[PDB]
């Protein structure tokens, strides 16, 4: 492990700059004595988001843009960003700044803070997120995702994948009609969930994640032919290759196996060619007169990786 730590550090140094596609580290880095709080806010929302999710466009790093809720000034001629009703809340965002960057958007996350309502009537509710739509005799809202929240629990952040909605909003500005946080309710009780910025550093905001164009320059059976890490066919005929006549079905399955050598300088220390994705296998066998239709996990090698 003494010489195994020494390599991870060097492999991480290259992995960082590789995902950033930086041939060398920045030079004119400013000084941390004064970094604007708005920049630290973007780091906080990306960090806290990934912490929650814990419960080749993917290799390269992604720029995170944070679009807060529009500030409302009652003295001007602006339509407020929020509209209330006992059963839903309405929020609208101004995404015109990212219309120029729409060709590089990868993912968007609507992050809203759910306050604690210690005097809530129902302790648990299912809320639904809709994309408001411009209509007659046609739809007025589009389903996105739902969530089960605890109205009386400690405050928490809630995130939704609203990529397709921001995509339309960035293309057709006349469709940016906002979001709606509606109560699920079976079919056509008040919304006991309170949200910061809507029911009153916890502002509702979008988290847009792009892949820069200059970062767009650059293992199922491709496996052509190769001798590096790559899937290899193996079909097990139960009678032939095992001498087993007790499994009635399947008569045989592609088990496959991964083989090859992985280079060093590797999406992930020394690398080894192992299996990544495995899929279960169902068999029908017999003991006595009893039939057994059973499920075996991790039996089929479908792809390989290096690690």
């Amino acid at each position, epitope marked *: 492990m003494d010489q195994f730590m020494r390599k991870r550090i060097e492999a991480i140094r290259g992995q960082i700059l590789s995902k950033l596609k930086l041939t060398s580290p920045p030079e004119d880095y400013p000084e941390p004595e004064e970094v604007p709080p708005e920049v630290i806010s973007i780091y906080n929302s990306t960090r806290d988001l990934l912490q929650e999710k814990a419960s080749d466009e993917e290799y390269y790093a992604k720029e995170v843009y944070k679009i807060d809720m529009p500030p409302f000034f009652p003295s001007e001629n602006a*339509i407020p960003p929020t509209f209330y009703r006992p059963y839903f809340r309405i929020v609208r965002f101004d995404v015109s700044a990212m219309e120029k960057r729409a060709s590089n958007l990868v993912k968007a996350e609507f992050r809203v803070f759910r306050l604690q309502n210690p005097k809530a009537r129902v302790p648990e509710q299912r809320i639904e997120l809709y994309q408001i739509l411009k209509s007659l005799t046609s739809p007025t809202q589009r389903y996105i995702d739902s969530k089960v929240v605890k109205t009386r629990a400690e405050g928490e952040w809630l995130s939704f994948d609203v990529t397709d909605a921001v995509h339309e909003w960035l293309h057709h500005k006349d469709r940016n009609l906002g979001f709606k946080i509606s109560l699920h309710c079976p079919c056509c009780e008040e919304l006991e969930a309170r949200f910061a910025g809507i029911d009153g550093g916890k502002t509702p905001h979008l988290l847009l994640m792009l892949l820069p164009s200059y970062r767009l320059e650059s293992l199922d059976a491709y496996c052509n032919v190769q001798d590096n890490c790559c899937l290899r066919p193996l079909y097990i005929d139960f009678k032939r290759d095992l001498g087993w006549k007790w499994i009635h079905e399947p008569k045989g399955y592609n088990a496959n196996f991964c083989a090859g050598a992985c280079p060093y300088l590797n999406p992930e220390a020394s690398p080894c060619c192992v299996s990544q994705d495995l899929e279960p296998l169902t068999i029908l066998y017999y003991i006595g007169k009893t039939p057994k239709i059973e499920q075996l996990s991790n039996m089929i090698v479908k792809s390989c990786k290096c690690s």
Partner: nanobody
Amino acid sequence: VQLQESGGGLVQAGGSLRLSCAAGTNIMGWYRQAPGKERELVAGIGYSSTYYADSVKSRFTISRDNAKNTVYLQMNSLKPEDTAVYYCAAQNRDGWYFYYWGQGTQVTVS
């Protein structure tokens, strides 16, 4: 479009009053300008969804008659600070502005 308001006058502190705004071909709301102070959006209806101001929360109520195309403003429990000229406003056909306004009536709390 056309905007016609009515129902404004003098009310004793703690009283009530119902303002009206008639529309002419949505999102609508009410503004107010106290003597000396600048405008402020008190209430707004839209998507029967409502936006009330923080200074009138729990007192003023907005509504609309989709049949008559009239927006109401039920101002109950008035206070000496609710004195101003009230201008109802409509939304531009497709933009996020207001554009259309009216003369509006005056309210005076004692």
